Amino acid sequence: SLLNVPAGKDLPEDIYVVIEIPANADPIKYEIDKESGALFVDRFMSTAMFYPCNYGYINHTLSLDGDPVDVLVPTPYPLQPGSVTRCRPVGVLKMTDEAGEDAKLVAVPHSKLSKEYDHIKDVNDLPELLKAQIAHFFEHYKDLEKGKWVKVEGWENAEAAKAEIVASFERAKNK
Amino acid sequence: SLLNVPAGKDLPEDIYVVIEIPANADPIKYEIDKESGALFVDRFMSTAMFYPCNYGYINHTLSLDGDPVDVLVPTPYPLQPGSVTRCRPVGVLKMTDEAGEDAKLVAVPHSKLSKEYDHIKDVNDLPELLKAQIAHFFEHYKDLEKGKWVKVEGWENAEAAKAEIVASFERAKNK
Amino acid sequence: SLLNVPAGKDLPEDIYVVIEIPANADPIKYEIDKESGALFVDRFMSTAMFYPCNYGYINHTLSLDGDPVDVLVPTPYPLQPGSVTRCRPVGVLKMTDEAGEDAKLVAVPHSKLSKEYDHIKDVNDLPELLKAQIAHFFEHYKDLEKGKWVKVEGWENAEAAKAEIVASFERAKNK
Amino acid sequence: SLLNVPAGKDLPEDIYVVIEIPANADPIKYEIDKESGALFVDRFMSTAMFYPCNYGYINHTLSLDGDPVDVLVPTPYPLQPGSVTRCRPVGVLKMTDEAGEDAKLVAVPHSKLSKEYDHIKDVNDLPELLKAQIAHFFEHYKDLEKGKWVKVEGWENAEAAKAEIVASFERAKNK
Amino acid sequence: SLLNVPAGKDLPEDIYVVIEIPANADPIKYEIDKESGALFVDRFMSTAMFYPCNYGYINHTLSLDGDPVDVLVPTPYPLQPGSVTRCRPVGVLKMTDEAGEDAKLVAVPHSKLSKEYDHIKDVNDLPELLKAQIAHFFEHYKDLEKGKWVKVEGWENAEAAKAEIVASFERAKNK
Amino acid sequence: SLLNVPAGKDLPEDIYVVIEIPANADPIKYEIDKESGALFVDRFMSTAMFYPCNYGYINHTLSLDGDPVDVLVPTPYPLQPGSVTRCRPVGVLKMTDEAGEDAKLVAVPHSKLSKEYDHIKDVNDLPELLKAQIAHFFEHYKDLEKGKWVKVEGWENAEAAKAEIVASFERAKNK
């Protein structure tokens, strides 16, 4: 049913993100099982860190690494895992890990759900604190994870973000 | 799967309500997408208000306004969004908005889930504080919402509530 | 979709548990409806007690009592109702109620989600406090429930636990 | 400073209760240290039970058992440990333990803080569910506690409650 | 001890606010008792509203209305009632009620506790959403309160805010 | 009042720790002000990390760095900031920062509050996960803090821990 959900209304400008992990939650990392569509516990994280933003993916996309693009979505309040939020891509956090290339997009709630992020149009528009903190989380989160590692490659603009969306959508399609 | 869920066991006396928003939660308003059945964020509310009761709808119903009846269900404890609770209708809060007529029913957990609300048989049986507070929420919640408004038209009995249930069920059916 | 979920990867050693009720939650007892697969409120508990562990079941199993085996899964952090966790059976709490025989298994997160419970291989490996507390909960939880009762019959090893899993799986299958 | 706090405005009708443990909290039992006035952890409870109401005491009182009277105060919402609430006594739960006689009073927020409990004038006015549940908690809470036990002796009216308040106040005074 | 706390390091530019009510909490309104210094429940609010910011006061100040100035302090995270936060005044919300004149200041965490609010220097620097929402809360919060009312008189700058601080400090002093 | 609190019952074996920051809380770092004894916000942390254990200090102690020893206390449940817990020292985490030498002790609830940590007698008795995670937190927590840094120097036994307690007590005394 969650596997039924669109990529967006008007890709890559207007997309839907399926939330897997809420902002500020306990460090349980969940994932939607592509087969059933149910939320599965992937791992209990060992580090005393929490996701700075709601974390999820854009359905009907296949990124370079085998998986749908992953998106981080700031909100006034934490969202329920498994809920879909309409968003608008604004930047990318480039990082390579041991999968190879695992960019995380940054998307802000679309303006129809709230006007609070209307001024956030590109990656420099986002608070520096927050960017520092996302980078920082991704750099350290798998610290205590034996066979897992991340090189935080840097930040990219909304155009690069939107290129990734299209490219991944296409990658999954036929057309 | 949630779109599979019945209206009730024995409509309008015994109904099932699909919970969209929990009592006392952060002001995120979710909704079940009729197409996929997943929970979607509709809007981040701007007012510093919270739903006094769990909020949801009765599936397989079509109210006047295009949507299933909406129900408010008091409980000892907040329920998870997307869960179904068996209830018994006891009153209605009449209000017209810019959709036209948007009555909210008030339903209490059926007696098989708890005996705590057995004495609540009709609308006057409900605490005055609570009624004041629901009315009050509905009157003000979209205050900061540009193109949205509500005239809280008053309270109605369980018979009026049950008439709405039947009428909406029928409206959606064929028969 | 949740009714689609497997029993396990490699039954009875490696199973999946579908979580209905989180550890430490408010005393709302939910259940997955076999027909729709949605989470339904079963009862508001009257006692001022909370489940010591996440509570759930193993799909595609039919226990003696008509239902799938029920499993209690300790975790660092409470899990979301409706999520699946991979586990490894380690003991059983035997108890008969007014259904007849309602053993609850005890399963620990598999080692791929966390190494924290690697040392927990059998029932004596589990903290005494916790065992006392599960027994204790099951003994008293339906105290204020008119037509419901439990005789906590005692604890059993992982072999007995795994026998139950197989036996219930088989019971549900054909083969 | 908390040891400075009065017994009440107009004892025994109008009293102040110093809250030690909130309603519904994790099972940590705190206590105010008479010497410093700070909140001290007394014990981590082993049972999977939670206090049904905010729990505290009336300062400047000496009960039979060596301690100030203990009061249970229902509220719409859980209170912070160490805060004082103005209340009005309405009933008593008689029970003897291994201290000897440890009645717990039941007090409702005074009407100046809320009108919600104005109808609660005597012990029969209180919900049956709640009374069952307090009795029930007190009966079982120290179950797993080696050298601790309770015989829940039954419920008493507001007059008996108010007699205890006066008697304990006097017991502590001179006059 | 809380009655011992200074007004600020360097009044009115650098002040300390004693937090009475946290941001986003349940609608319990607490207050520090000037006599003991303990936190007292003042009222259970009847409206389904929550304070948008942490709410408190500046000690050693006497406002026009008989009380210390009241301050609203935004923070990344809710603060504990009774804790002191160092802040910097940036604006005022003028409103008259039935006390007569009850301005609420708006203060941001000082830069030594966080750099997140360094850009917030004056009242226009604060998000519009937030200002709308504070105004909005103050306008409606005592709606269901019989003998209580508020006319939200409008917003003022940091200079007006700082004038109030000095003036109130002086009012309480001698010198 | 909190400045009145003893170091312990029977130093260094049996000590009291005054809790400043709870386990798993939002990343607000509080501190008790030696002058008033009230809890003060020190800093909003910028990293998306949370204290793995309740964090506090032993009153009437002066460590090398100018401050009382700091203690980390695991508990079943998070404690309230400002509450005192009786503990028993079991290990030390040596680390030097830009203060110079800032060892953090590790103390477990005394056995009179719970038997759950009776087996924890020395530093190797503590879970490896937890030790990894404390080390890990201390190593990274001030990452985004300009003028602050930590070299996690390693772990030490209970004897070294108890030597620190005595030495710091003495340092503060006269005798």
Dump the DSSP string for F112-128: TT-STTTT--STTSS-H
Q: Can the peptide bond before residue B27 be classed as cis, meaning omega within 30 degrees of 0?
A: no
Report the distance separating Cα C8 and Cα C86, nearest Å: 8
Quick one: tokens of F151?
A: 């070299």
Tokens 């070294």, residue located: F160
Contact F115 C129 (CB under 8 A): yes
Residue F12: partners with Cβ closer than 8 Å, 6 or more residues away = F89, F161, F162, F163, F165, F166, F169
Contact B115 D127 (CB under 8 A): no
Sign of CA dihedral C64, C68, C70, C71: positive
Contact between residue D64 and residue D94 where contact means Cβ atoms under 8 Å apart? no
Report the distance separating Cα C128 and Cα B110, nearest Å: 39
**H or E element: which one contains F21?**
strand F14-21
Quick one: tokens of A74?
A: 């700031």
Kindly state the DSSP code that residue B49 receives in the 8-state scheme.
B
Residue of A nearest to C2 (CA): A38
Residue A175: partners with Cβ closer than 8 Å, 6 or more residues away = none
Contact B75 C28 (CB under 8 A): yes
Task: Please report, for residues A48, F16, F95, F167, the alpha-carbon distance to residue F170 in angstroms, rounded to integers and kept in the order given.
Answer: 34, 16, 22, 5
Contact between residue C107 and residue C158 where contact means Cβ atoms under 8 Å apart? no
Quick one: tokens of F115?
A: 């038997």
Kindly state the DSSP code that residue F52 receives in the 8-state scheme.
S
Q: How many CA atoms lie within 13 A of A63 on its CB side?
A: 22
Cβ neighbour number for residue B169 with a 10 Å cutoff: 22
Contact between residue D69 and residue D57 where contact means Cβ atoms under 8 Å apart? yes
Residue E97: partners with Cβ closer than 8 Å, 6 or more residues away = E142, E148, E149, E150, E151
Quick one: tokens of D116?
A: 């919600």
Report the distance separating Cα F37 and Cα E97, nearest Å: 35
Specify burial of residue E43 (Cβ count, 10 A radius: 0-12, 13-18, 19+): middle
**H or E element: which one contains D154?**
strand D151-156
A141 labelled ligand-binding: yes
Print burial letters for A46-84: b (CB count within 10 Å at least 16), e (below 16): bbbbbbbbbbbbbbbbbbeeeebbbbbbbbbbbbbbbbb
The count of domains in chain C is 1
Q: Which residues pair with E106 in a beta bridge?
A: E72, E91
Residue D54: partners with Cβ closer than 8 Å, 6 or more residues away = D17, D19, D21, D22, D23, D72, D73, D74, D75, D78, D79, D85
Chain-centre distance for alpha carbon C67: 11
Provide the strand spans (E) within chain A. Answer: 8-10, 14-21, 28-32, 39-44, 54-57, 70-73, 83-96, 104-109, 151-156
Q: Residue ranges of the alpha helices (H) in F31-91?
A: none
Measured between beta carbons, which residues in chain D are less than 8 angstroms from residue C48? 49-52, 133, 136-137
Report the distance separating Cα D17 and Cα D19, nearest Å: 6
Contact D41 F76 (CB under 8 A): no
Cβ neighbour number for residue C139 with a 10 Å cutoff: 16
C133 φ/ψ angles, rounded to the nearest 5 degrees? -70, -35
Report the distance separating Cα C24 and Cα D60, nearest Å: 36
Report the distance separating Cα E53 and Cα E57, nearest Å: 13
Contact C2 A38 (CB under 8 A): yes
Contact between residue E69 and residue E58 where contact means Cβ atoms under 8 Å apart? yes
Full DSSP string of chain C: -TTT--SEEETTTEEEEEEEE-TT--SEEEEE-TTT--EEEEEE--SSB--SSEEEE-TT---TTSS--EEEE--SSPPPTTEEEEEEEEEEEEEE-SSS---EEEEEE-TTT-STTTT--STTSS-HHHHHHHHHHHHHTTTT-TT---EEEEEE-HHHHHHHHHHHHHHHS--
Q: Is F166 helix (H, G, I), strand (E, B) or coil?
A: helix
Chain-centre distance for alpha carbon B62: 13
Task: Please report, for residues C81, C84, F73, the alpha-carbon distance to residue C5 in angstroms, rounded to integers and kept in the order given.
Answer: 15, 8, 40
Report the distance separating Cα D11 and Cα D17, nearest Å: 12
CB nearest to D46's CB, from C47, C48, C129: C129
Contact between residue A90 and residue A109 where contact means Cβ atoms under 8 Å apart? no
Full DSSP string of D18-87: EEEE-TT--SEEEEE-TTT--EEEEEE--SSB--SSEEEE-TT---TTSS--EEEE--SSPPPTTEEEEE
Q: Can the peptide bond before residue A109 be classed as cis, meaning omega within 30 degrees of 0?
A: no
* Resolution of the PDB structure in angstroms: 2.2
B102 labelled ligand-binding: yes
Q: Is A134 helix (H, G, I), strand (E, B) or coil?
A: helix
Contact F41 E78 (CB under 8 A): no
Q: Is F164 helix (H, G, I), strand (E, B) or coil?
A: helix
Report the distance separating Cα E33 and Cα D9, nearest Å: 14
Report the distance separating Cα C58 and Cα D95, nearest Å: 43
Residue of A nearest to E132 (CA): A116
CB nearest to D129's CB, from B116, B127, B129: B116
List residues in chain D touching E: CB distance below 8 A. 1-2, 4-5, 18, 75-80, 82-86, 109, 112-114, 116
Report the distance separating Cα B8 and Cα A171, nearest Å: 44
Cβ neighbour number for residue E102 with a 10 Å cutoff: 21
List residues in chain F touching D: CB distance below 8 A. 1-2, 4-5, 18, 75-80, 82-86, 109, 112-114, 116
Q: Is D120 helix (H, G, I), strand (E, B) or coil?
A: coil
Contact between residue D46 and residue D145 where contact means Cβ atoms under 8 Å apart? yes
Q: Is A128 helix (H, G, I), strand (E, B) or coil?
A: helix
Task: Chain B: list its partners (3+ Cβ pairs within 8 Å).
Answer: A, C, D, E
Per DSSP bridges, beta strands D104-109 and D70-73 are parallel
Task: Chain D: list its partners (3+ Cβ pairs within 8 Å).
Answer: B, C, E, F
Q: Quick one: which of F38, F39, F43, F40 has its CA closest to F28?
A: F43
Specify burial of residue C29 (Cβ count, 10 A radius: 0-12, 13-18, 19+): middle
Report the distance separating Cα C102 and Cα C91, nearest Å: 14
**A-C C-beta contacts closer than 8 Å:** 62
Sign of CA dihedral C73, C77, C83, C86: negative
Contact between residue F167 and residue A78 where contact means Cβ atoms under 8 Å apart? no
Q: Quick one: which of E60, E88, D34, E77 has its CA closest to F36?
A: E60
What does the longest C-alpha to C-alpha distance in chain A come to? Answer: 44
Candidates B79, B83, B116, partner chain C, best to mutate (most C CBs within 10 A): B83
Question: Are E and F touching by the rule of 3+ CB pairs within 8 Å?
Answer: yes
Task: Please report, for residues D28, D112, F22, F138, the alpha-carbon distance to residue F72 in angstroms, rounded to integers and kept in the order given.
Answer: 18, 42, 10, 11
Residue of D nearest to F37 (CA): D38
Contact between residue F73 and residue F104 where contact means Cβ atoms under 8 Å apart? no
- AA identity, residue F109: P
CATH code (residue C105):
3.90.80.10
One-letter-per-residue 3-state SS of B125-164: CCCHHHHHHHHHHHHHCCCCCCCCCCEEEEEECHHHHHHH
Q: Is F73 helix (H, G, I), strand (E, B) or coil?
A: strand
Cβ neighbour number for residue C2 with a 10 Å cutoff: 21
Task: Please report, for residues A31, E76, E102, the alpha-carbon distance to residue E57 in angstroms, rounded to integers and kept in the order given.
Answer: 45, 19, 12
Q: Quick one: which of F71, F86, F60 has its CA closest to F175?
A: F60
Contact between residue D3 and residue D37 where contact means Cβ atoms under 8 Å apart? yes
Residue of B nearest to A112 (CA): B43
Q: Can the peptide bond before residue F12 be classed as cis, meaning omega within 30 degrees of 0?
A: yes
List residues in chain C touching B: CB distance below 8 A. 1-2, 26-28, 30, 33, 35-44, 46, 81-82
Contact between residue A64 and residue A129 where contact means Cβ atoms under 8 Å apart? no
Quick one: tokens of C99?
A: 């259904």
Provide the strand spans (E) within A33-139. Answer: 39-44, 54-57, 70-73, 83-96, 104-109
Kindly state the DSSP code that residue A11 receives in the 8-state scheme.
T
Report the distance separating Cα E146 and Cα C70, nearest Å: 52
Chain-centre distance for alpha carbon A78: 14
Report the distance separating Cα E55 and Cα F67, nearest Å: 31
Report the distance separating Cα D57 and Cα D8, nearest Å: 11
Kindly state the DSSP code that residue A49 receives in the 8-state scheme.
B
Cβ neighbour number for residue B66 with a 10 Å cutoff: 8
Contact C116 A44 (CB under 8 A): yes
Question: Are D and A touching by the rule of 3+ CB pairs within 8 Å?
Answer: no
Report the distance separating Cα F50 and Cα F55, nearest Å: 11
Q: Is D93 helix (H, G, I), strand (E, B) or coil?
A: strand
- AA identity, residue E22: P
Cβ neighbour number for residue F78 with a 10 Å cutoff: 17
Alpha-carbon Rg for chain A, nearest whole angstrom, is: 15
Question: Are C and D touching by the rule of 3+ CB pairs within 8 Å?
Answer: yes
D103 φ/ψ angles, rounded to the nearest 5 degrees? -60, 140
Q: Quick one: which of F72, F133, A147, A31 has its CA closest to C76?
A: F133
Q: Quick one: which of A131, A60, A67 has its CA closest to A97?
A: A67
Provide the strand spans (E) within F33-82. Answer: 39-44, 54-57, 70-73
Report the distance separating Cα F169 and Cα F171, nearest Å: 5
Measured between beta carbons, which residues in chain A are less than 8 angstroms from residue B35? 4
Provide the strand spans (E) within B1-150. Answer: 8-10, 14-21, 28-32, 39-44, 54-57, 70-73, 83-96, 104-109
Domain holding E73, by residue range, is 1-175
Q: Quick one: which of A35, B20, B104, B68 has its CA closest to C38?
A: B20
Specify burial of residue D121 (Cβ count, 10 A radius: 0-12, 13-18, 19+): middle
Tokens 């005996």, residue located: B115
One-letter-per-residue 3-state SS of chain E: CCCCCCCEEECCCEEEEEEEECCCCCCEEEEECCCCCCEEEEEECCCCECCCCEEEECCCCCCCCCCCCEEEECCCCCCCCCEEEEEEEEEEEEEECCCCCCCEEEEEECCCCCCCCCCCCCCCCCCHHHHHHHHHHHHHCCCCCCCCCCEEEEEECHHHHHHHHHHHHHHHCCC
Contact between residue B95 and residue B106 where contact means Cβ atoms under 8 Å apart? no
Residue A141: partners with Cβ closer than 8 Å, 6 or more residues away = A45, A47, A49, A150
CB nearest to B1's CB, from C1, C43, C44: C1
Binding-site annotation: residue ranges of E: 29, 43, 55, 65, 70, 102, 141
Q: Which residues pair with B152 in a beta bridge?
A: B95
Quick one: tokens of A61?
A: 């996309």
Report the distance separating Cα C141 and Cα C8, nearest Å: 29
Contact between residue F106 and residue F92 where contact means Cβ atoms under 8 Å apart? yes
